[PDB]
Amino acid sequence: DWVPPEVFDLVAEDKARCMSEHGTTQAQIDDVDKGNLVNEPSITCYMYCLLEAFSLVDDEANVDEDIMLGLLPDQLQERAQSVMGKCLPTSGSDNCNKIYNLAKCVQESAPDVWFVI
Ligand SMILES: [Cl-]
């Protein structure tokens, strides 16, 4: 990752709250970061919950492209713009399913740009 140690202190209160709400284990978060995505609410509602905590998504899992881009380092923004060209709009049966399809889409197309923690 390009995510610096500090960012783990930042999202700590929100990460812990998002894991309680959805029954998420740390092993599930590690599976996402090794490219092993499964359509399970405890992991995909966690992803939605974290994104929602940092205003990357609204109430129907529509992504805010400018906020999502400004979180990435400058170096990846060209490639992230192209990935976002492909993977947006979001799509799915509910918010958790939308973030699932987004994650699978972003990972398939460019592992570097996907922000789960
Ligand atoms: Cl799902």
DSSP 76: G
Distance 38 CA to ligand 1 centre (A): 8
Exposed, middle or buried by CB within 10 Å (0-12, 13-18, 19+), for 31? middle
Q: Which amino acid is at 1?
A: D
Task: Report the distance separating Cα 92 and Cα 35, nearest Å.
Answer: 20
Distance 70 CA to ligand 1 centre (A): 27
Residue 36 CB partners (closer than 8 Å, separation 6+)? none
Name the structure determination technique: X-ray
Q: Please state the φ and ψ torsions of residue 63, each to the nearest 5 degrees.
A: -85, 140
Task: Specify the resolution in Å.
Answer: 2.6
Residue with tokens 């970061």: 33
Distance 39 CA to ligand 1 centre (A): 4
Residue with tokens 């799509």: 91
Task: Report the distance separating Cα 48 and Cα 22, nearest Å.
Answer: 11
Q: Which amino acid is at 53?
A: A
Distance 75 CA to ligand 1 centre (A): 31
Nearest to 66 by CA among 91, 84, 87, 44: 84
Q: Please state the φ and ψ torsions of residue 39, each to the nearest 5 degrees.
A: -75, 55
Q: Does residue 85 sit in helix, strand or coil?
A: helix
Neighbours of 60 (CB within 10 A): 9
Distance 29 CA to ligand 1 centre (A): 14
Domains and CATH numbers, the chain: 1-117 (1.10.238.20)
List C-alpha distances in Å: 62 to 74, 76, 108.
Answer: 23, 21, 20
Tokens, residue 38: 């499964």
Distance 41 CA to ligand 1 centre (A): 5
Give the helix, strand, coil percentages of the chain, each rounded to 5.
Answer: 65, 0, 35
Residue with tokens 């992230």: 80
Is-contact 96 30, C-beta < 8 A? Answer: no
